[PDB]
Amino acid sequence: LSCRFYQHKFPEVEDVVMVNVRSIAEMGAYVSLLEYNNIEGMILLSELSRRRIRSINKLIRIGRNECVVVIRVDKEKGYIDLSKRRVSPEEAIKCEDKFTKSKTVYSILRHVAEVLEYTKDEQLESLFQRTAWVFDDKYKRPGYGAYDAFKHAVSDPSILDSLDLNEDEREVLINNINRRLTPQAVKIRADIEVACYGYEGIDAVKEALRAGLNCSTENMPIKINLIAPPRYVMTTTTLERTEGLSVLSQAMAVIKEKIEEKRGVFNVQMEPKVV
Amino acid sequence: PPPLQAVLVADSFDRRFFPISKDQPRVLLPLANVALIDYTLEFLTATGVQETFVFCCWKAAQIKEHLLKSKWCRPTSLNVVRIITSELYRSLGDVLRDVDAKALVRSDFLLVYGDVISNINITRALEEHRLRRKLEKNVSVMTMIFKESSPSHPTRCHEDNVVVAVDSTTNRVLHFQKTQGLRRFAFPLSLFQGSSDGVEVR
Amino acid sequence: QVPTRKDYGSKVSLFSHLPQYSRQNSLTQFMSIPSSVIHPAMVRLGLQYSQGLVSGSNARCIALLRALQQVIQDYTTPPNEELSRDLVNKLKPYMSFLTQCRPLSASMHNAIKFLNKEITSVGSSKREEEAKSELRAAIDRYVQEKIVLAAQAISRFAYQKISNGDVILVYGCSSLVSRILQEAWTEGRRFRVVVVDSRPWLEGRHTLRSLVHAGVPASYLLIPAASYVLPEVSKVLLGAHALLANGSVMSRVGTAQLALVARAHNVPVLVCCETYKFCERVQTDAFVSNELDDPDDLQCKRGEHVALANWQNHASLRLLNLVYDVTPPELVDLVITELGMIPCSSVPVVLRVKSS
Amino acid sequence: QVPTRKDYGSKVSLFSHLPQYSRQNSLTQFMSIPSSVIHPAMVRLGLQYSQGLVSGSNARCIALLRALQQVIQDYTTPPNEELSRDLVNKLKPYMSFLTQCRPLSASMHNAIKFLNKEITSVGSSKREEEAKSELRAAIDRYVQEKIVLAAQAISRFAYQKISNGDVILVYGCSSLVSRILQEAWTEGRRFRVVVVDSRPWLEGRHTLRSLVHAGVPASYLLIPAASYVLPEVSKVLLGAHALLANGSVMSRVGTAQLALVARAHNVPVLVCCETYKFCERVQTDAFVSNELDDPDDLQCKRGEHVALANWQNHASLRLLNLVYDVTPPELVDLVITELGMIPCSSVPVVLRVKS
Amino acid sequence: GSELSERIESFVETLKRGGGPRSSEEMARETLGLLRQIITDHRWSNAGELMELIRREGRRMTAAQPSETTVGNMVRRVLKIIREEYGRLHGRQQESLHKLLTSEDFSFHYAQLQSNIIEAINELLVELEGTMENIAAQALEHIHSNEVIMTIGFSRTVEAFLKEAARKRKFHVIVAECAPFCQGHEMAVNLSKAGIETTVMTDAAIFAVMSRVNKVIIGTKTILANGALRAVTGTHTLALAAKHHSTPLIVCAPMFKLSPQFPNEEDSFHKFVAPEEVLPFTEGDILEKVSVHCPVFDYVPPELITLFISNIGGNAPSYIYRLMSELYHPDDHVL
């Protein structure tokens, strides 16, 4: 029960690919292209490193995933020639990201096929062809297109409605997409010690706390609570932690300005951070 | 838990070093070409202390000047040192009263003197103290550190020799006294009424 | 496919990790007469390895390379395949069968590695006939420059050490030592040779006959009596089946003993070997890697009775027939190669300069 | 009959022929409280042997001889019996019990042989109290002239080998070495001593304390670091539990190792031993004859855990602590005896002139 | 920037105060990562300036703890990598007679240099991943059936060696505890959990038991220029006993433990620690007059070593001079 991650059965010249080493030979290293349904490949002895290499075991470490570009492809003999000395870190990291998103797509579609109890691999191939490759061709970008399409369809299932698989199949796919790729939950917490030893001490502290809490945006209520008599804690479970940290920093700055205006003292015990 | 803190009393409120201490504080006396304050600061830093308070009264200017040029006052030091001076200090009790007055500490700080040579890591002792405090709900107030030794060692001076009666199963101090000039030690019976199961005299 | 040869008798507990066969048991009794799985040339080569018709390391390497040239000549590339990989994949079972017939030697291992490298380097865009001809020519050049010219150079180098009126002690049978002695005698050196032999092969009679036919005065004795003749021996010249990367010399079973006894009598030790027998592996004893010959070869007739006739009946009785030993580098003075006269510790250095 | 002591734990395959007991398990659990089968002095001596209260070879021999004197004092010959062989027959089970408590040492073996020869030599016409008094006096004289006078003579002989400003390396604890060093310091020689110790007994602290109390400068280190201090060491002075007929020196486990490392550093080796510890037996290694101590003594607390706590749970794990080892005669330069300074190969000669 | 300096301070403080990282492999990995960060997160114009910066950082790190030679080895490996890259990308060594008979500057910034260097470092890190497995894979060609192996102390490389060998053969292993830090107990119990039939003894019985030992397999802390070893204490005695009985002594050590220094720095060679382990503080007054020394390392001459097993295979101690000539440059020895 397996299928290719992309529509092409064989990679084209100069495509950076994930491989998994399985043995060693005189020519080089046998591998299996993971996203091409475990077809065997070859990393040549003469392309392992830019420098002078002594042995195969120096760098291969059989049993480990590796990011290798391809130079020569021969489909009639099933010969695919790879190379490591030509890849670069940027290509390596983008290949890893592309591979992991394609793996997530394959995992969700395999789960759909399993929950629909398709024993034959041809049925799984048909399901993977109807949904993934349609969007991949529509966006003209293999790998990226499918993952982006499911990410968009997790919120609005209108795109997934155009699929012509089935009603139960569509329901299962929607449920899997909404239960797998919708982990939107983040908490930003901070601690601030603000107090004023003035005439209206408690009043100024309450006013500063209210002014800080008023800066809370929609779907992000800053639940300020008193941890210790001199120190309060701001906690807010809001997604998009990149914006949450900025919101917490702005609220802390506003509270500090309000406290300093009321002739008081304020300090930041702990900066905003995730839970 | 908050970062570990430490109160470092940089002035011994007793004159055991006349006339040497009349022109140089005992804290700045070179032991092995290195001042005692450096040794105790290194001990505090190596054991995980992240904030240190030095309370120096006698010749506090020299101590301040020496500390400011030391390694621990650099911006790269993980042990932040705060220098507080006052001419009104007369004893360690005054230092602790000032600490409570200004509320320097929040929980489970370290009390050491400015002339302590050590390499002790207090991680296990601190964990035991915190666990005991959590289980007993704020009953254990202090955990004193002792070193296994022999009465005949040169380090065991007659002045600071101490005999301690403890509960062997919970490491609780039940009685504590100094043996300066005493040829015979005495222990009250009230020790044995509570922890009759086990009592040790060390 | 080809089955596995059956172990014969009971092995020593310390040598239980090595295969031990019998000469009577042949692996070809379970293979088709017009052999298909194994090439007929390889079948004949394995048959004459197992029966002992080819013994010397140089002879074994030459026979392997000849049979391998025949295999390459008969080889035809399958459709929809590449020669540079199919040839190696086809050759591997032949090597496994040859190992089953008799464990491979260092020279054969080096030759196999050389041919694997040569085949791997064959271009994918060249004609089959050209590739086959180039492989045959490469095998011929390897044989020439690694045996013939090497032996000539080693003889020329060893002519310097051999002086007039000295005594040279040789052990076992080796073509290099015999050629060195014969050439030295031809050029005008006058000397004696003492031949040391050992059971059960008794292959020192080959070099004894060669020296007698060459006209060199010779003496013959068994190895236990070696300590008797070393007082009048001036040099100990030995042949090596392999040189290891740590300097240790792998050779016949008695060789190391001689070196030791030579060290007891203050006699210089020379080892002559060709550089293609240099091995990058290392071993410190004759236990981790060796070959157990037929135990029944240890039986000897002393009078009218054979003591070890039915040795299988005694359950606690074991026989081992070792064929190799390892000599530490501190018991060897000279190594004579086609590169020149080197110390015993320069073996890796040569291995470094022959690989680049 | 005295029950057979049970072996504790699993032994090494190469040492399966040697007994291995546990310090906690004693024979007296299966013995009458008022000792009847064996003399109370003998059971007391066996208990203090097994628990380790008597360790030194000379101390063990002296304690055994005192216990034997106590046994002889209370001995009463049965009617229609002769003392000469009845006493030996009575003593044999005592020796068996003592061997059960802990294997006998060379000094104890020689003392037993001497006492048996003395008892056999007692005439039949001798009257009981005179024979007992003669045996007691013979035991006392043997102790005197074989320990005290021998140690004095050896200390006098070793005074000439010790010069001013030299370094002497000693191993373990032995009364002879300590006496030699203290007397040499008293006479006026000035030197240093280096004390080498080994686990688990750690008995070098005894001689370290003795040297400190005597005033001799001393250094302390464990056996693995010995190869570090031998560059500055001038002589290696060792004590011997026994000298064998082939010249081999049987001693504590690290003695032969120290001799080998000292030979590697070109340091002379002196061995001090009394002629009553010379044995007619020979052995070429520490395997054929040795003693296995309690394996649980090897457990040590490093940090907060004992790595070998439940070592018997692991089926394939064995613990080995030898008690003695054998130094070949070629690693020893001097043997200092009351007869003088002799080569290591003259041990049988002494054995020839002492009988 | 600031984070790089903070990491450098943390590394040097961890080095000079106590342990960390636990394993030598992890320490080498951390050193290489720190060197990579220094190369990237810092501005240098010429290759010589980068070499000077690396020299300063390596000098500080080695002065933090001279006994940890792996940091210096990584620094010198990085310097050699820089030299090789500059020479290859600028023009086209090792002071031989050939160069003397047939007859430099490190200026001239080239843009392609830096990235290349990084790649090389990554390659280095790659061979740090499979080094232990590479060493262990060749254990079956050195252990035969019913052999008697002897080991001193705790070594992860030797542990992997024996655990891989035990999957197909039965043999006996004796472990001598390395007093005072009896770390041999941990290795003994670890081997016993694998059913290797292990025996434990104190390291005072090395000579007595060597007569029945077939092979000695040990680890090491540092391999010196002439093939000598800086090993745990008691290893010199073990080697002496093995040489006396002519039992081969195998050293299983990776290639990053090779240090181009010679044993003439005897003063800092051993690491002397508190004498509490040897003689406890509870002894009393005798501690006033007694000198106690507790070295944890000792020097083993190359003549007592039979073989060197590393991730590149087997070698003799006579070949070590070549290996370092392929790893470090002669001008980088002093650093």
Residue numbers in the entry:
A (entry chain N): 3 to 277
B (entry chain J): 40 to 241
C (entry chain G): 166 to 521
D (entry chain H): 166 to 520
E (entry chain C): 8 to 99, 105 to 115, 120 to 351
Article, verbatim:
After the recognition, eIF2 is released from the ribosomes as the guanosine disphosphate (GDP)-bound form and regenerated by its specific guanine nucleotide exchange factor, eIF2B, a heterodecameric complex of two copies each of the α-, β-, γ-, δ-, and ε-subunits. Various stressors such as viral infection lead to the suppression of cap-dependent translation and the activation of the integrated stress response (ISR), since the stress-induced phosphorylated eukaryotic translation initiation factor 2 [eIF2(αP)] tightly binds to eIF2B to prevent it from exchanging guanine nucleotide molecules on its substrate, unphosphorylated eIF2. Sandfly fever Sicilian virus (SFSV) evades this cap-dependent translation suppression through the interaction between its nonstructural protein NSs and host eIF2B. Here, our cryo-electron microscopy (cryo-EM) analysis reveals that SFSV NSs binds to the α-subunit of eIF2B in a competitive manner with eIF2(αP).
We also analyzed the mixture of human eIF2B, unphosphorylated eIF2, and SFSV NSs, and obtained the cryo-EM structures of the eIF2B•SFSV NSs•unphosphorylated eIF2 ternary complex. Most of the ternary complex particles contained only one molecule of eIF2, but small fractions of those containing two eIF2 molecules were also observed. There are no notable structural differences in eIF2B or SFSV NSs between these two ternary complexes. These structures revealed that SFSV NSs and the unphosphorylated eIF2 can bind to eIF2B simultaneously and there is no direct interaction between them. The SFSV NSs binding does not seem to affect the unphosphorylated eIF2α binding, because SFSV NSs-bound eIF2B is able to accommodate eIF2 without major conformational changes. The only exception is the quite small closure of the interface for unphosphorylated eIF2, as observed in the comparison of the eIF2B•unphosphorylated eIF2 complex structure with the eIF2B apo structure. The conformation of eIF2 is essentially the same as that in the eIF2B•unphosphorylated eIF2 complex structures and the switch 1 region in the nucleotide-binding eIF2γ subunit is widely open as well. Therefore, it seems to be trapped in the nucleotide-free state. The binding of SFSV NSs sterically blocks the inhibitory interaction between eIF2B and eIF2(αP), whereas it is compatible with the catalytic interaction between eIF2B and unphosphorylated eIF2.
